[PDB]
Design an enzyme around this catalytic site. Structure first.
Site, PDB file in Angstrom:
ATOM      1  N   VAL A  88       1.142  -1.186   0.073  1.00  0.00           N
ATOM      2  CA  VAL A  88       0.120  -0.107  -0.181  1.00  0.00           C
ATOM      3  C   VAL A  88       0.333   1.185   0.261  1.00  0.00           C
ATOM      4  CG1 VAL A  88      -1.557   1.336   1.424  1.00  0.00           C
ATOM      5  CG2 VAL A  88      -1.662  -1.555   1.105  1.00  0.00           C
ATOM      6  N   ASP A 112       3.566   5.714  -3.034  1.00  0.00           N
ATOM      7  CA  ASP A 112       4.682   5.979  -3.705  1.00  0.00           C
ATOM      8  C   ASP A 112       5.671   5.997  -5.192  1.00  0.00           C
ATOM      9  OD1 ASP A 112       4.788   7.022  -1.380  1.00  0.00           O
ATOM     10  OD2 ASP A 112       6.311   5.331  -0.412  1.00  0.00           O
TER      11      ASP A 112
END
Ligand code: COH
Length: 210
Positions: free
Chosen positions: A126, A131
């Site tokens: 996640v 990112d």
């Protein structure tokens, strides 16, 4: 059928809800500033520290070793970014955790102390894939709207990863190659939805000023 796909479809709802947070809406649409974004990275450094402790503990157990790439570590780079963002390293002597970040940190320590491999991979997926994806968009809007020095955004740049598209493809392949029991597979898929809920309340705290 297909862990990377099954993960992306199970969390597709919460992923769309993650881009719609009040704090993250104002931040990307040019309504906040460098101060509010620095607050985001200070909470990030807190739970990214707790996450990578769990990554280190799970990696030492031999679980999902190829997936837990050390080149994904963000805590030190965040500390280097917070030095520039605060213009001083004296942020370390005054960091505070909002309630939701404390709740996020407690779970990552729980995963660390249990060496919960599958639950760790959920949080690993996640944060780091976000990112490598939305973070690239967040990094751009920081420069475009607020003129933040591109070197105070090193959290969103991965020095070990040149081809992000190839790496994100390589990451999903290791997800599909994980050998998980049906018990582990459901535990991972449930924690992924939990991981998005943890992040969603982190951004709800930011927008609420907690
Ligand atoms: C401004 C855009 C934006 C924001 C704010 C955002 C905020 C967040 C956020 C903050 C709470 C988290 C935890 C995530 C987490 C993820 N994001 Co985004 N993402 C964003 C744009 C994207 C884009 C674009 C992708 C590529 C795949 C897709 O489904 O859109 C993405 C993909 C992801 C993936 C990989 C899906 C997959 O391929 O399986 C994860 C995990 N994410 N994201």
């Amino acid at each position: 059928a297909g862990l990377a796909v099954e993960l992306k479809q199970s969390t597709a709802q919460a992923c769309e809800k993650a881009e719609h947070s009040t704090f993250m809406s104002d931040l990307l649409k040019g309504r906040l500033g460098v101060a509010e974004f620095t607050r985001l990275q200070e909470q990030a450094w807190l739970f990214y520290t707790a996450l990578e402790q769990a990554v280190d503990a799970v990696r030492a157990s031999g679980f999902a070793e190829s997936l837990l790439d050390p080149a994904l570590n963000r805590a030190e780079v965040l500390a280097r970014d917070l030095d520039k963002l605060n213009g001083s390293s004296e942020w370390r002597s005054r960091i505070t955790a909002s309630p939701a970040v404390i709740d996020y940190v407690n779970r990552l320590e729980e995963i660390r102390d249990n060496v919960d491999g599958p639950a760790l991979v959920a949080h690993h997926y996640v944060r780091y894939l976000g990112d490598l994806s939305g973070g690239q968009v967040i990094a751009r809007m920081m420069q475009r709207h607020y003129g933040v020095d591109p070197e105070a955004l090193g959290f969103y740049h991965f020095e070990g990863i040149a081809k992000l598209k190839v790496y994100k493809d390589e990451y999903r392949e290791k997800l599909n190659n994980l050998e998980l029991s049906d018990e582990q597979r459901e535990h991972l898929l449930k924690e992924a939805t939990d991981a998005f809920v943890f992040n969603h309340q982190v951004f709800a705290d930011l927008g609420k000023g907690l």
